[PDB]
């Protein structure tokens, strides 16, 4: 018989990568509010300290680790520490990422490769590191933060789009390969999200979006909790777009 308790993350541990601020912080905050214990990593101590204070201010007793997501040995060690200090990771959110804006033919091979490493290879490293324990626990969730660039291209973001497209298929592959072990791997694909770090451009976004507003990180919270919960146990290899209708809409024409 259905219960709203199917949405609850009580008793579960979630690792959200790069969750010191922004979208990762918002998803982790919502997870905590839904009942979860929060663990997170970032590239330096300063960012970790920032996230730790922000969690504390929100009433959340988070566990923060310095670790590069592209460092497999580092990640494996971090997961080992989390398991001994906190418990088994039930839910992984691959949120850590970078973006570069550079005309493709101007982009150096090193810079292209670096965006691929963090945005595509790293979610494989982290997923790889958490999956064995999820299988033994008898249930896992892996939520990959995708993008509208998992679907559509744009000048200057070639590396990013290639990575997010790859991450979309990595999601479908993990679902296919580990679905039988009761791992659900899905994507959240944010539309246009109004960040601190961001008019004709405003009119442009508003026109493209049926909802007729920018999204906010708060719009991602419900969808992210749904995918981390028992309420989505038969949702697998699926990219949940949270874009107020952008991907469905040809656009507001004159």
């Amino acid at each position: 018989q259905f219960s709203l308790d199917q949405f609850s993350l009580k008793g579960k541990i979630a690792l959200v990568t790069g969750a010191s601020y922004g979208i990762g912080f918002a998803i982790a905050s919502a997870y905590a509010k839904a009942g979860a214990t929060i663990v997170f990593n970032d590239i330096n101590q300063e960012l970790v300290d920032r996230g730790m204070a922000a969690y504390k201010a929100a009433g959340i007793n988070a566990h923060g680790y310095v670790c590069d997501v592209t460092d497999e040995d580092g990640i494996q060690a971090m997961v080992a520490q989390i398991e001994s200090e906190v418990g088994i990771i039930d839910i992984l959110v691959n949120n850590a990422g970078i973006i570069r804006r550079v005309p493709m033919i101007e982009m150096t091979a090193a810079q292209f490769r670096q965006v691929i490493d963090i945005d595509l290879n790293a979610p494989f490293i982290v997923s790889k590191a958490v999956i064995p324990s999820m299988i033994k626990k008898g249930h896992g969730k892996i939520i990959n933060i995708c993008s509208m660039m998992s679907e559509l291209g744009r000048e200057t973001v070639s590396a990013y789009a290639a990575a997010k497209g790859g991450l979309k298929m990595l999601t479908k592959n993990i679902a296919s390969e580990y679905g039988e072990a009761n791992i659900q791997c899905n994507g959240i694909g944010p539309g246009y999200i109004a960040t601190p770090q961001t008019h004709p451009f405003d009119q442009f976004i508003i026109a493209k979006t049926p909802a007729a507003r920018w999204g906010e990180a708060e719009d991602l919270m419900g969808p992210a909790v749904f995918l981390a919960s028992d309420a989505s146990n038969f949702v697998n290899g699926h990219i949940l777009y949270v874009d107020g209708g952008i991907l469905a809409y040809i656009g507001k024409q004159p």
Copy 2:
């Protein structure tokens, strides 16, 4: 600040079409459990009486109406009655449908047209009938029950696939056209669902599905509540597949 209350349908009224048994009944039951008031229709009194008893047995005080979903005048009148006797419909689930299995070249034009009328035209009639009041209430949800046949074809189900493909685009169109009025129109696309009314075929389904089991109507409840709730307010024109990984998977090969 996030709350699990975003998943609650307390204080809301949902119309689920054809919800006397099966998947419609399961979605309506879950909606009631999530807090909603349930209204539903079916083609004859007998089916309505069946649904009414089943709701009562589940502890749900449902409101049932005899109405053909392809009868616009009938539907408009029914919505008028629901508004006077129960209240404004906040949530519509276009669940009523038929399927026929007939080689396409053997299918009569009347039979093709009939599957189209019920499975595609009727959800437009019903959506049309509820949208004006949703706009005035300041929020609406329309959930269209799609299919894997919204994406993939099969021998014998030409009319059904054409209808479900159409319903997929009708969903994206309603999102595009009414998203600005705070209507979210989305799809639920069930995978293989074990019904009462249904081994090498068993092996076939199990192999195709990463989850390695048939779905059940219970698997649709969490996804359907999510789409009817405030937790998905920035999800629009989106087809949520609930298939245990089928659409993501090339298949279990020898």
Copy 3:
């Protein structure tokens, strides 16, 4: 060993529905230039006479018939006449269609149903009528003229989008069901095509399109010949978009 002759339609007969002017005329003209014999239908004698003169002026000896595509008995009789007077139809292009622009809630059920009948049901009627002879000939092609509205919605075009979405799935279904009989059924999905019957709107289209121009009916000719030919024999249930990059592009932002 590969030959460019794989693109040739020499010795083949093509039926293009509604091919008296516009996109249908351009596809039929190209088919004739590629070697094909052209047959076509339209709703009245006047349109047929128009197409007949235009073909003659282009050096093409076309065969024109008055027939409503929603009239199955009429279509079956027309195919019977074409078979006795011209030969077996090797290639069908479902091009005939209508569009209406009407806010969905303002659209009458009759008008919705009429767009569905012509744009979705009729291509099933016509496909049904040609498939038996294609199977006996040992090869058939059916090209369905889809739209960007097979993928994306817009205000005022609800019925049209629902039909084109349906037509997309009808294409995939015919492929699935008749592919084994050596029928290839595919779609052509035109982007923005500059028609006679059509500035900030100009800037809008140009920005949305990587190619940075309106498409023209001439842009559809190569893709349509490819799909009607031996060069695409292993292409089946596929929607070939011809849009200069629109569907791939998030858009030219400020």
Copy 4:
């Protein structure tokens, strides 16, 4: 006015990467037959010598170079040599690739990264190297060899699927970013192709495929020539699947 000459590659130079045997060789052979001058690269002299002899036997005067596609400096130098010895590359086919079959959690980070480097990063390197000259010539084509794994996952092929998914989005990005410079970048996505280097598995493939046969490299020739030619000039950011209907079909059930 349409001509079949729109399919001709006369007067054009094509670079097909890794085209010493297999699918690359078949596409290059067809390109030569369509009128093109053939250049190709492979990882060692032995493979190059093999391709060179096979071209000669087919009546084709190919130009072969030893170059690793992941070596940007090497690729840039090779393109410089091709330009001085042969001419400007009008058409690039990113065909070079590797596949590994390894359960994801068993896959080393080095091996994952290597499949990504060759199958995703390398097509960016090669595209980057040819685009400036294409722009100056006033027309370019880039055809990326994708896969059904650009769309669907499977056990053991996580890295490959992630790369091909990425390559799909890289294609759409190049289209978006360089479409205005009259570059058309598209994908060919082969279905199941019977290779030398390859029964219940036979029954499995035959059932999944509406065409009810394995594909062959010859099935890719027409689609590949179409995408390299003037006949597809308004086709951009598009993945042309050549799979006999697999992606359109739910499967042949018992």
